[PDB]
Homo-oligomer: 209 residues x 6
């Protein structure tokens, strides 16, 4: 990544590398994997981002979907930012493929990211990757919120956990009280109805405790 | 977070990230998880705080209660601190949503936290989160102190552990001798009665050892 | 804690935090936990010390005894050092509750600890905590030294280990040859008697090997 | 490796050393081992690269293939860059065997890598090694893409994972929609045929979900 | 410990603390524990050395022998270096109890160790401790070298391992070919006799392979 | 070790210490242990090298062979470099025993290693140790290359792994195609014969796949 000390390039650490590999091995593409990726790739160059994605073994259906998303965003970038035999020793303008690190060198990437003003190719590429990762999360979300209904003897708290877990995956962690009540079991629904509208989640959970 | 070297921004470390994820996985929302969160988020930006909260998988009923608490505190902040097309290159005043990191950039957050004098948006947001976490702890406290009574053959020490464990959860670690005696078993109660008032916990525990 | 680079404040590390939590989980309040706490809290602010104590789940009977000890020492501090509407921008004198971190801010704590000359509130508070921890160790010491006697077929070395383990807990690691001999079994006692007085532990152990 | 602070030599870290040894022990020569090697050997001298390769126990058939590849590339380097009793205290030009670290000292390697302009012998040697590693990956790829066909009751997602896993190994992670459809089972093939051409992978996977 | 940056005091690290605790837990007082202690206590103050010794739970017979050894060496130090109401703001001369850290403060210890010329109280105290540890190792050595004899079907290599393991413990790793031959089994003894004198260990082991 | 910042002495790290102990515990004296030792002892003083060797428990037959090798090399050093009551405050010339750290202090070792020009006693001693370690590896190599022959149903790849593993141990990783073919089973030998001479290992392995 690029870090302070002056802004200088640093090697990706074994700790960072292992942390990413392990979270994928344990969590696959549960929603919480996205903010972990984002956090672990803080200051990342496009090379660093490709490194992290490449260290993943398996999950290749998802990674191909990721590739396709990246290619679309790169095509759109080029449409919005067309580049014009470059002047000797001068910084060239990055194309989509340069941002994704397929046609740019590390030194070029460092040049853009540390320029004044910077062309933040690390942040732009991360944005495309996170967009692709959110799509994978939505695809792999196993259950519709319509099918999350409280069991006859399921504690209300356990039901609320499932409801908001499902909502998070279906929306890729991007921001329902009435539906929560509607999908509650008849005993807790009666109690929640009696609370009326404007009840907080805390109050609803206390009531069905 | 923001740290010294001059006050500069640093990437959240994999060690910090993993420590938070693991403590939640092992301890859920036992009271001791709060001071761990506070300690692990030392110097945290609002982005860092959202990162830590987002890395948590599951417990989504609690996180939604947390969200609601944050939104209330943000609404109250705006009521107390209304903001007035900003002057070119000047620092704007943070709204509630800027403190919670939904409408502020990392650079803006860095600007407020390192300003002279600082607008400590990291500390303000942490305060709202801890307030929400304490409510979760109180909600998930399984037992009333009224039901913590010493067993006929339960060692006094074991009883005192349960009593103060329960008191801590019920009060979210925010600061009873008579009730302790009252809920003791008849043999130890007789002994403690004979000690009289003004006995320390140490003396009470020695007496029923 | 406060450390050198100039004396500056640093965030407590995840390594330190986890080390303390784990040693308590594994060793409870065996004597060796005290020097570990002292070592892990090197340079600690009162906030850091409260953090470490708060990260402990369970053992709440002991922590309440710790609280009581802290409150006594704070009351005594105030008796010895009474404080007199403070001058603008000037350092106030710490009360007992400021040293224990209940009524002082981190910035105030940093101010006292790094002042010239320093008011070492971190060291003063640690002293009160260690005093409380030593009392817990003495309370939880399961066996009197009077009951540590060598078994008929127990190796002398194994007996000496138990004797000095017990002595350490009973005295909270704060500094017997005749009693060691007296509590030895008849065969080793005969041999040790024949060595006479002035025998070192090494010589005694060699003799009953 | 060589790193910034001025460009200076640093000892390879135990963390780096162990990370490489462990990834080989767990993953052998699965494709994802290559980007891990590349990442762990960031800034590596030829000595460092030989160190990492030498710390591997077993897999000696592969390492001999690696040796042969390195020797070929070294022979080609010498053909392209012939060297001409060197001037006192002056930098000599590296031969193939100097780049591979068999006939060069660490100090010479440091001299080339930190020269102005640099002769990047660490990067040149890594390139030869990665070339050899990609060949090992292609050799050890157990299955042809022609044999990856969707099972009668195999979920489409599971099939796509195998297809792109196989494609990655066969091509050593160096960059098929029609073949994917062709190798799908009759039920999903019917559905995919009906989507027509121009369908993204996402759309194809949604359709056969 | 005291380290470079100027010679400054640093807190003992959790890594160092845990490494010492664990090596004792796993190896007790096998000979190899001594050089580990010495290495882990590099630059240690007397306080640091007491910390490390105090973090050990159990083994209290050995630690009491250690105490006695330390007290003897302290008594001898005072005999050799008698100290003479000290001049204001001046460095006092350390007594035995100051070197062992029972009557000296950390600041005094830092003063002696970083003085010009230094009074290396950390190194002097470590020397006394290692002397005591070597005695513990000799005491706990379970077997005399006279009882290490090669089994009828024991591989010569396995016998040599036991012989030199025993010799190391008996001598506390402080520096026999004829005895090695003498204690060999009749078949290997015949072969070694035929080699004659002046045979290296390598040659002897090859011969009885 | 000695490292850059100016060349200064640093304490050997707990990570380094543990890494060496563990690799020996897991790998004994498999060939790959040598480059690990070399890598872990980067910049090592003779004291550091003795530390690492001393932290090893067991394997004492091998360590005695190591001792003997070191003593021979020290004797040869003295023969080649005889030393001549030294001038006050001046650097003395190191003897063999000074290089091996038996008669030299750490400060003397630091003096030689950081002198201009340096007398690299750390590198000289490491060379003697590695020479001794290579001999141990050759001694403990369990199998002659003459006995590595492909099984009737053993995959060619598995056979090549054994062949080059054996060759590495027999030669202590110091640099056969005809012998590889000669020791292949009759079916693969027929195929390899038909390839003719000049076949690479890759081609041979593809042919017998
Ligand atoms: C964790 C989570 N669950 C969801 C369910 C449905 C939709 C989105 C989500 C999210 C992501 C989610 O909303 N995460 C929060 C952080 C957070 C996490 C946990 C508790 C409180 C705050 C976040 O990133 N931001 C910017 C945020 C902050 C305050 C209020 C609203 C949003
Ligand atoms: C740990 C704990 N148990 C409780 C039970 C009921 C109510 C609150 C709690 C707490 C939190 C709790 O009180 N923690 C203590 C720190 C502490 C922890 C353990 C032992 C001694 C001191 C704390 O944070 N502060 C500021 C404090 C310090 C000294 C006296 C009183 C309070
Ligand atoms: C470890 C231990 N066991 C005891 C039994 C009864 C009373 C006290 C104790 C102690 C604490 C104990 O005495 N620890 C020792 C350090 C130590 C530990 C182990 C071996 C040698 C020295 C200590 O802290 N100091 C200051 C000390 C140093 C030298 C002589 C006497 C005391
Ligand atoms: C991971 C993978 N699977 C493959 C299958 C066939 C051929 C090659 C491969 C690769 C390597 C692979 O292509 N890795 C990608 C990084 C990557 C990994 C995972 C998802 C998205 C991007 C890469 O290194 N680069 C330079 C790249 C970046 C964007 C588009 C195309 C290529
Ligand atoms: C490891 C060991 N085994 C022994 C058996 C009997 C007596 C002493 C010992 C020792 C300690 C032992 O001798 N350790 C060696 C280091 C060493 C360890 C292993 C192999 C080679 C060199 C040592 O510390 N020094 C100073 C040394 C160095 C070279 C020659 C002689 C001594
Ligand atoms: C790993 C190994 N196996 C062997 C079998 C017989 C003889 C020696 C060995 C060695 C040591 C071995 O040769 N290691 C290689 C590094 C290496 C390791 C693995 C693959 C490619 C290169 C090495 O140290 N050097 C200097 C080297 C580099 C390029 C060509 C030839 C030698
Ligand atoms: Cl893969
Ligand atoms: Cl979730
Ligand atoms: Cl608790
Ligand atoms: Cl091998
Ligand atoms: Cl103990
Ligand atoms: Cl040993």
């Amino acid at each position: 990544p690029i870090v302070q000390n002056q802004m200088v390039h640093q090697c990706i650490s074994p700790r960072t590398l292992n942390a990413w590999v392990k979270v994928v091995e344990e969590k696959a593409f549960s929603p919480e994997v996205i903010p972990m990726f984002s956090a672990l790739s803080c200051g990342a160059t496009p090379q660093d981002l490709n490194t992290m994605l490449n260290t993943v073994g398996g999950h290749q259906a998802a990674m191909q979907m990721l590739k396709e998303t990246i290619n679309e965003e790169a095509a759109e970038w080029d449409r919005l930012h067309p580049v014009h035999p470059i002047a000797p020793g001068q910084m060239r303008e990055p194309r989509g493929s340069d941002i994704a690190g397929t046609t740019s060198t590390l030194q070029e990437q460092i040049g853009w990211m540390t320029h004044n003003p910077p062309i933040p190719v690390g942040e732009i590429y991360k944005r495309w990757i996170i967009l692709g990762l959110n799509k994978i999360v939505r695809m792999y979300s196993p259950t519709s919120i319509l099918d999350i209904r409280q069991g006859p003897k399921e504690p209300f708290r356990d039901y609320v956990d499932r409801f908001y877990k499902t909502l998070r995956a279906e929306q890729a962690s991007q921001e329902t009280e009435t539906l929560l009540v509607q999908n509650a079991n008849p005993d807790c629904k009666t109690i929640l109805k009696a609370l009326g509208p404007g009840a907080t989640l805390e109050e609803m959970m206390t009531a069905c405790q």
